[PDB]
Amino acid sequence: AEITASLVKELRERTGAGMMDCKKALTEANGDIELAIENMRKSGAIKAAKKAGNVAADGVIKTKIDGNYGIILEVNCQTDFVAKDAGFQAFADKVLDAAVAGKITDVEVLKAQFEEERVALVAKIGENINIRRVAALEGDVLGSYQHGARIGVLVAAKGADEELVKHIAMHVAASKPEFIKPEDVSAEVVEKEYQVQLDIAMQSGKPKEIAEKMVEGRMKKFTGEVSLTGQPFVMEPSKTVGQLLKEHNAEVTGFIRFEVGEGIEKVETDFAAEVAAMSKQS
Amino acid sequence: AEITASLVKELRERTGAGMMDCKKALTEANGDIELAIENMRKSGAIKAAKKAGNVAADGVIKTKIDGNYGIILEVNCQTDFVAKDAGFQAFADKVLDAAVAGKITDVEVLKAQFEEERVALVAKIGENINIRRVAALEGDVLGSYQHGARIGVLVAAKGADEELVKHIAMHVAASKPEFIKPEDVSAEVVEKEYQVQLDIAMQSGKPKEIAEKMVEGRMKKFTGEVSLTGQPFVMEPSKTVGQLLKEHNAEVTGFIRFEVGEGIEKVETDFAAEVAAMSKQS
Amino acid sequence: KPHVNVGTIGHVDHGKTTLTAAITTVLAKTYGGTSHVEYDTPTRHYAHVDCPGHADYVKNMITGAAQMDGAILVVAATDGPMPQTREHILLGRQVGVPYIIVFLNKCDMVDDEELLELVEMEVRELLSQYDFPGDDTPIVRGSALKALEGDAEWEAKILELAGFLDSYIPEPERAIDKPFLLPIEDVFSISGRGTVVTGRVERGIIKVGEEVEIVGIKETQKSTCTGVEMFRKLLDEGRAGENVGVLLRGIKREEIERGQVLAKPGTIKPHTKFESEVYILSKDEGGRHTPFFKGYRPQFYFRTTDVTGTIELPEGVEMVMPGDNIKMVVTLIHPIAMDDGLRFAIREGGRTVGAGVVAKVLS
Amino acid sequence: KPHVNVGTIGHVDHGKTTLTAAITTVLAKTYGGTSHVEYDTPTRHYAHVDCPGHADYVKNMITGAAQMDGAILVVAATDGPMPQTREHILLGRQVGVPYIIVFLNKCDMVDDEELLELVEMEVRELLSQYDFPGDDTPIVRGSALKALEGDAEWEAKILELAGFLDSYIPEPERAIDKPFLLPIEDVFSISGRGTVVTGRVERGIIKVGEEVEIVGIKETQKSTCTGVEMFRKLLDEGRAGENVGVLLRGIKREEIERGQVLAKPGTIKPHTKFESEVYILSKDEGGRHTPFFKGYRPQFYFRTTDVTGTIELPEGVEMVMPGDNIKMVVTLIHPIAMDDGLRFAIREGGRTVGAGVVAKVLS
């Protein structure tokens, strides 16, 4: 069947695929738009496989609380333009809902469940999209905080109202503690850190006596700085979150903080030199 | 000779020793002021020995430069009122000069040389006074910065003027770097710190591959935080001290920072409780 | 020679860097020959940047490093618009890029003009949806690779684009052409003749005899230019760029202050409230170490002085961290001469902790 | 009963604590009655702090944590003044302590009274050398150990000291006795009567019919109180400590503003330049994380409003770190009612990063 511009347009209208991709698919299907759609469906994976090589450091972090159950999710893409895109947003939200509905905390299953959709989405957008990680937090009182689509955090507490839990979530988003209380830092970590701070003092030419005495002091702070209760409340640095909690007879039982692209080495592109490399041809 | 109030005043206004210490020494010296001065020397060592057990966490940091040789020193006392005392200043300054003059970096030798004088001063000031430490910095161009009597800094540079060196000494005083350049931190400590960070990341629930890539990123700031050239210039945080130096074709060869009381307890007293502890019977 | 700032907006794989290379190579051989690129036509000089990120572009645009006069939407005809093309155009709308020219890339691979027709229809419709003259928008059907391959048939298309940059985008208005305005710095009197306000002429010309208006901080006032003097040389007029000292007529010193502005009567009005696009410096950029909240009351530095202000953060926003882009409705403690597009800095205790741009005057 | 704030200053081993233990003990045994102690005599109530350090005291005074009405210098008769005794008196001078009473401790251990004469003359000359009335200063010859031991002969000396605290240190002026002063917070217009200004009466009493001056920021104005009210009920007068709204005669709404002050005519003046004792908070106290330099221009919060100002640091001083005590000559951008002793907060973008006290008014 002759592939008219309108035929290609019709295929594209219902597939969201590229002008020429639609054209070529019809060439194979010989005008049968139905076969074309199926073929293109099979092609999506190859197109997605090609893009899988591209670094996806952008994206969004999403949080969702349903009772005493909450999920935090990271879905990546290449540019924030797509992170803003309705198609991407819809996919991310759908993954979130499923994650909460089915209590899914294992990314492998979640990835598996959305593989076909992801592939179809990537084929249209032309950017690597990837469900990176997902986690849940349970507690008496659950609160969340989104710092744009960039940072997301879940906070579980006891004897704390919504406003308190929101403030602690904001603090976690800003201060990145990795423990709840100082006493949660293993004696092992403390010892390792002691040695490190010791080697640094020593090389400084400091007398062993003075050096150790100093490090001994600096260590007493260490646990506080890496811990939620030991960190100064961002909204009022004159008190620690620990005091804030005591003033409210509250206790934090858990928290999780995700930030888009953590662990991914985003490259610092130099346009000027990139163009220069292209200017080789003449 | 008869020991009269007039005579005691003569020895006190010549020694600065306690009224009664003068009275007792004159009486036993039988009016001989010079002998009484000698008696007090003997008894003074015993008074200084008595005070020797008190914590002297206050004091001053002194710095003096002489061409390509610089000296930084710490002399302690119990209270700041004494640190601000002319006699104490006179003592610390004399110890400083001698250390520069004779290039004395061994605090034991310095202590030995000023022991008699220290005992005399302690006997008239009534506070534990101690020559705690001393070090020398050598370089092409030497600079110093005293932030009050509290913090003292010496800096060695190459191709840097008095003002730049001074500004760097101001930065060292404030930001406390421990290495000059980020590359100065040994691979042994960078690795040790990597492990500490990795342990904290792992316990945070982070999946291994993510936790490792995150720790990896934190190592770069680790070395930049502990090094002079990697830190943000205090007078202009938008640039590191390395950039400031590059734009001056200057280089830092070394630096030393002393701060009064470093590595000493900082006891803390409770006046009210102490008063109550004394309000026993009648 | 006119200076136009342009930029490329498009899909990562649609050939923006390639086209930009084709632009330099072709313009060079034909006429004589955030990081950016530069090239010239016989009429203008161009500063060309790339817009790889929305927030990224916004940040640069706020910090004074962007201000596009026209944008090139690079859409490869092999695919046509991508879903994110809406976001590419939407950014153009949000920052208010005045003109958009389209470059259909990879046209050499579209085995049918009818297909090139379809792609165009889509592009023009998307542009219209965001209020751009879709049907008046220059759309060049080119190919960056072939042009770069010296294929004179395609190089022609590159110059066609350069032609549109020259025609579609009009010559940016010159400062000398803009009405006279001078940001007042120091105000001193000579006695022998009159009061003098010092400053660099921001725009236009001030000639002796001309009347002016003192806008900002206090109720607007009018006065007459009784002499224009520059450093070590008296002249008859202060022009754009020239750091001068304007002598006025019968206006007492305590009536004119730093922060106020001299301007052609009627050309600029004072305001207290406005909506602004703001960027907060990160710690590494020399800004705040911690985030601020709703009660933040910094100073807004307009041209030559700080004016304290109250901030209205967006609904649902209660924390601004170093490195954030954010919209804020500000209420200054007193008026300051302002127009939309007016840049300002945010300072704390005298130090700059952020930068901003007046998006919409309110009061 | 009248409240008086006293403090002990003296050599570490001279018995400051012992003396204090003795004072509380004897007064209770006799009359039945920042980490301070408190004691009462038949006439007054005392709050007694110790001053172990110079910088600590200055900090605590500045942060309001402690400011003496009288100081008791404790010197043991056995030694007599120490070299650092001048450092003790010098702080007393530096922080404007009004009266210094001396208590010679361990007098029971000195044999010759002519020696006690010597010690007293040394103390008197030291005092005089720093402008304290050495000649009139009460020097009690005691023994805190013996008084504490119930030794009546020495307990009497404790009562003699308390007696000087009662007679030598003037009964502090109660706020209600001082000339009226109300820091304006909100201003309201009404029609039917006039403009109302709200605030908490700092000191004195404002009554209907009494004239008041509107001081600060703008040129002083004078008006008459037409009526006082609290919780919309028209009161008879407004006393110190009460929160009220003062109704004014012939004063327009926009003729008054927050930060201005209401006061008995001719009792307060607006000033722009002054010398101050300032304390900058440390990171752990919620203050700055980094040091500031010569060009720092924060806001000085005076009573109810901020006033930007520039600073002048002592010679040789080029950097101030969080946690530092420092004297500085401030120059406000506009006048604000003040006088020596007036405390204030230093802020950046609305947050307090330090505190200070107006030490000497310059302009």
UniProtKB/Swiss-Prot annotation, chains A, B:
One of its GO terms (cellular component) is cytosol. This is Elongation factor Ts. Residues 79-82 are annotated as: Involved in Mg(2+) ion dislocation from EF-Tu. InterPro entries: EF-Ts_dimer_sf, Transl_elong_EFTs/EF1B, Transl_elong_EFTs/EF1B_dimer, Transl_elong_Ts_CS, UBA-like_sf. In order to produce high amounts of bacteriophage Qbeta RNA polymerase catalytic core, a fusion protein consisting of tsf-tufB-replicase with a cleavable linker between tufB and the viral replicase subunit is frequently used. Changing A201E: Resistant to toxin CdiA-CT-EC869, partially resistant to toxins CdiA-CT-NC101 and CdiA-CT-96.154, but not resistant to other CdiA toxins in growth competition experiments, in vitro prevents CdiA-CT-EC869 from digesting tRNA(GUG-Gln). CDD domains: UBA_EF-Ts. PROSITE patterns: EF_TS_1, EF_TS_2. Changing R218P: Resistant to toxin CdiA-CT-EC869, partially resistant to toxins CdiA-CT-NC101 and CdiA-CT-96.154, but not resistant to other CdiA toxins in growth competition experiments. Resistant to bacteriophage R17. SUPFAM superfamilies: Elongation factor Ts (EF-Ts), dimerisation domain, UBA-like. One of its GO terms (molecular function) is translation elongation factor activity. Associates with the EF-Tu.GDP complex and induces the exchange of GDP to GTP. It remains bound to the aminoacyl-tRNA.EF-Tu.GTP complex up to the GTP hydrolysis stage on the ribosome. Gene3D superfamilies: 1.10.286.20, DNA helicase RuvA subunit, C-terminal domain, Elongation factor Ts, dimerisation domain.
UniProtKB/Swiss-Prot annotation, chains C, D:
Mg(2+) binds at T17. GO terms for molecular function: GTP binding; GTPase activity; guanosine tetraphosphate binding; RNA binding; translation elongation factor activity. Residues 1-173 form the tr-type G domain. It catalyses: GTP + H2O = GDP + phosphate + H(+). It comes from the Bacteria. The modification Phosphothreonine is found at T352. The modification N6-acetyllysine is found at K283. Its EC number is 3.6.5.3. The N-terminus is blocked. PROSITE patterns: G_TR_1, G_TR_2. Residues 105-108 are annotated as: G4. Changing D108N: Reduces affinity for GDP; increases affinity for XDP. Residues 10-17 are annotated as: G1. Transmembrane segments: none annotated. It is a peripheral membrane protein. Changing K106 to R/Q/E/I: Reduces affinity for GDP. The modification N6-succinyllysine is found at K29, K146, K218, K222, K264, K283. In order to produce high amounts of bacteriophage Qbeta RNA polymerase catalytic core, a fusion protein consisting of tsf-tufB-replicase with a cleavable linker between tufB and the viral replicase subunit is frequently used. GTP hydrolase that promotes the GTP-dependent binding of aminoacyl-tRNA to the A-site of ribosomes during protein biosynthesis. May play an important regulatory role in cell growth and in the bacterial response to nutrient deprivation. This is Elongation factor Tu 2.
